[PDB]
């Protein structure tokens, strides 16, 4: 076969078992079975408590979740504990490679980006908590090695398509399709700990540690009519996103849509907003105002001297949340209509574009 893949294993996503390099006895880093508790070094036991997945974020830092219950590394006063992910600054760690095989885990004070400490045990012969230390240079007691490395099988992501094409009418009586053909703009991977689902966190970690969000666009029909020559007709058009839809997406993937059609990221997903927007070809909002649903009335005039069939389309963006098996999670549509991008399908095709009149907002 004629192509060579240059992807190197360690630069991907995988499950790992961790132990300290200087440790002679077979101790492994061990997460508590309970959702909350102290991170400890225990005898290596091949249990899910000792299998961890590092979720990479925008700035290189990682979120360290265990394979048992999905709780993550949480930095406290003097030691590291296991707890539920909330997007707290104390749950972001940096993997610093001193050598090709050894590394240490660093956490920086949210109060000062200068105060950075590394994780270190107080014993190699006994079970120990993971304490902080400021002595980093030439200190090998903080060095961690990977006992095991199990590579994940990510779900197949769809190929990106170009922007959706405006529907073409077949005749005068053809109102056209209610929707055009859906085009996939992009898709992005999201850690299971940042989404809502009926599957437990522990089970997600084992079977679908990564979900993915799909971004598709298409033209949505608003109205269609046969315009008499010289006729002026008033049409109702909608734009934005419904309250139900906003709430569903916000609870679903911890993302909302701003009034500038940019994405608002909550505490959970704020750390991956750069990768999220890049993969989905979207933008981060610059306003604090949320997108809402608006109903317009626009006047359209057929300037032609013959009957012309017109159908108004508005550009729609839909987001869907999927599991690793491709199943869609959300049962409520996450759709936003943008009236800045509208197109008027017409028959006959050579007919001119309708003359836009006055626009009024419906206050129901």
């Amino acid at each position: 076969l004629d192509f060579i893949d240059s992807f190197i294993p360690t630069e991907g996503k995988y499950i790992r078992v961790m132990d300290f390099y200087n440790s002679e006895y077979p101790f492994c880093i061990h997460a508590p079975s309970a959702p909350n508790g102290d991170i400890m070094t225990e005898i290596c036991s091949r249990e899910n408590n000792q299998y961890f997945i590092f979720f990479p974020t925008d700035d290189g830092r990682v979120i360290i979740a265990n394979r048992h219950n999905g709780s993550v590394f949480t930095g406290e006063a003097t030691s590291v504990v296991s707890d539920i992910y909330t997007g707290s600054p104390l749950q972001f760690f940096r993997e610093v490679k001193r050598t090709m095989a050894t590394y240490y885990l660093a956490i920086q004070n949210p109060e000062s980006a200068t105060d950075v400490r590394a994780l270190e045990p107080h014993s190699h012969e006994l079970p120990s908590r993971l304490y902080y230390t400021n002595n980093i240079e030439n200190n090998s007691n903080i060095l961690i090695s990977n006992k095991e490395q199990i590579y994940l099988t990510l779900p197949s992501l769809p190929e990106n398509e170009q922007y959706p094409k405006t529907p073409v009418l077949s005749g005068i009586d053809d109102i056209g399709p209610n929707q055009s053909e859906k085009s996939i703009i992009g898709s992005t991977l999201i850690p299971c700990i940042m989404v809502s689902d009926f599957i437990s966190l522990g089970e997600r970690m084992k079977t679908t540690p990564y979900y993915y969000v799909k971004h598709t666009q298409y033209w949505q029909s608003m109205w269609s009519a046969l315009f008499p020559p010289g006729s002026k007709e008033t049409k109702t058009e909608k734009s934005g996103i419904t309250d139900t839809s906003q709430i569903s997406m916000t609870d679903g993937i911890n993302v909302s849509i701003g009034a500038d059609f940019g994405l608002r990221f909550g505490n959970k997903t704020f750390g991956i907003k750069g990768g999220f927007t890049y993969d989905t070809k979207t933008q981060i909002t610059n306003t604090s105002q949320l997108l809402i649903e608006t109903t317009y009335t626009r006047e359209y005039t057929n300037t032609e001297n013959f009957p012309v069939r017109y159908t108004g389309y508005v550009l729609a963006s839909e987001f869907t949340l999927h599991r690793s098996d491709g199943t869609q999670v959300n049962t409520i549509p996450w759709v936003a209509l943008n009236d800045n991008y509208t197109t008027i399908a017409r028959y006959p095709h050579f007919a001119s574009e309708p003359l836009l009149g006055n626009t009024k907002i419906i206050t129901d």
Binding site: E95, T282, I284
Partner: protein, 419 residues
């Protein structure tokens, strides 16, 4: 492909005041300020209804913007000096990447009726950019800590409201199509030395758009650079870089030196031109000038941020190989080369930087398989290397099957790893 730049990062917009009745906005006028306690000079950002500025907003990783001018290539800067009522003047200045040159854009207003505007904030929204005193008079732009809530509406807020007007397009190069890496080139005879790096088939794996303010291109003035090369193209490519090519006699063991990595000279060159360089893990490292864009750049390049502070250097290793065949065999070894090319909008190549990745390598031969038996690595010694990020050698003997890519981290090493 798509680098996913915002619309305002692709245009030099004329910034008008929202509430001005006489078409006042940000200007490059040479006339001084007409307001009493609003002194101007040569560095001042002016406000006038004539000689408009056309400004682009380069997007930083954290969402804030660099505001650069199309004509002189300088950027907006918040001066530390104090004016009346303890306000900072906004001045024109060469790009440095300091915090004083970063601005946060905040949109507000009636988005539904298209009556929205935007402001510029600094220092975690503790200061807002504002006209000095006037709405419809020639004055200066400044930073003030006097921020009013939008409700109830304050008149002073109108001095801060901006909208987008006319624009020029920023010069943006097209992104190349990605391609697949070929198989390791086979020799066709005993006299075939194989494929040299200058003739090797490149595969495009990534590309990034670099703002011209972080690129050092001494062949152009800052005006031409900003206007004709607003974004430079940095493409990432891969090819098979030959390490050596030699005929190995039957049943003989030969010493062969393998030189990989990257020289300090090349590292310094990339640092000087782009404030970027290669880490020992072959990930990207950045210095102050371009550090603000490192996340966007790496996502485009499809090369990761480095997780080490150790700089990649030259790697000289001595290997001993044994030919287990009853005949002389032409052997040639290639390693994975990671190539970065800086191009202008027109396509002209500015400079090339190559790192040779010893971790991915393979060997081909003539006569090929199944006529001949695979070459065997019997001894491995690191001769010269200025860092100990990777002081590991292969556990010998190791067989290099023709065409097979040996991944160093997937083999047994000395000292032992992953165990």
């Amino acid at each position: 492909l798509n680098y996913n730049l915002p619309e305002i990062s692709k245009k030099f917009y004329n910034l008008k005041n929202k509430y001005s009745r006489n078409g006042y906005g940000l200007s490059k006028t040479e006339f001084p300020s007409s307001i009493e306690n609003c002194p101007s000079n040569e560095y001042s950002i002016m406000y006038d209804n004539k000689d408009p500025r056309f400004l682009i907003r380069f997007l930083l990783d954290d969402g804030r913007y660099i505001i650069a001018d199309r004509d002189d290539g300088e950027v907006f800067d918040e001066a530390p000096t104090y004016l009346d009522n303890n306000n900072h003047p906004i001045i024109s200045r060469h790009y440095t990447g300091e915090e004083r040159q970063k601005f946060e854009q905040v949109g507000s207003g009636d988005y539904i009726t298209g009556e929205q505007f935007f402001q510029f904030y600094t220092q975690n929204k503790t200061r807002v950019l504002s006209n000095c005193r006037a709405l419809d008079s020639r004055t200066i732009l400044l930073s003030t800590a006097k921020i009013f809530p939008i409700y109830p509406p304050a008149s002073e807020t109108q001095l801060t409201a901006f909208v987008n007007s006319s624009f020029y397009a920023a010069a943006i190069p097209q992104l190349p199509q990605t391609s697949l890496l070929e198989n390791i080139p086979e020799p066709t005879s005993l006299d075939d030395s194989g494929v040299l790096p200058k003739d090797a088939v490149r595969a495009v794996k990534g590309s990034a758009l670099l703002p011209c303010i972080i690129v050092h291109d001494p062949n152009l003035n800052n005006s031409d650079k900003m206007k004709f090369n607003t974004y430079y193209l940095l493409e990432y490519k891969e090819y098979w870089h030959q390490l050596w090519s030699q005929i190995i006699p039957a049943h003989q063991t030969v010493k062969i030196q393998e030189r990989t990595g990257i020289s300090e000279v090349v590292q310094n060159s990339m640092i000087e031109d782009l404030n970027m360089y290669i880490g020992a893990d072959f990930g990207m490292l950045f210095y102050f000038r371009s550090s603000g864009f490192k996340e966007q750049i790496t996502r485009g390049l499809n090369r990761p941020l480095s997780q080490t502070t150790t700089q990649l250097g030259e790697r000289v290793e001595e290997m001993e190989y044994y030919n287990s065949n009853d005949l002389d065999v032409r052997y040639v070894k290639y390693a994975l080369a990671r190539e970065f090319t800086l191009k202008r909008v027109n396509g002209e190549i500015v400079k090339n930087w190559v790192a040779v990745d010893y971790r991915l390598a393979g060997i081909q031969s003539y006569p090929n398989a199944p006529i001949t038996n695979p070459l065997t690595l019997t001894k491995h010694t690191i001769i010269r290397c200025e860092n100990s990020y990777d002081g590991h050698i292969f556990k010998t003997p190791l067989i290099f099957k023709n065409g097979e890519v040996i991944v160093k981290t997937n083999e047994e090493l000395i000292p032992k790893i992953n165990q």
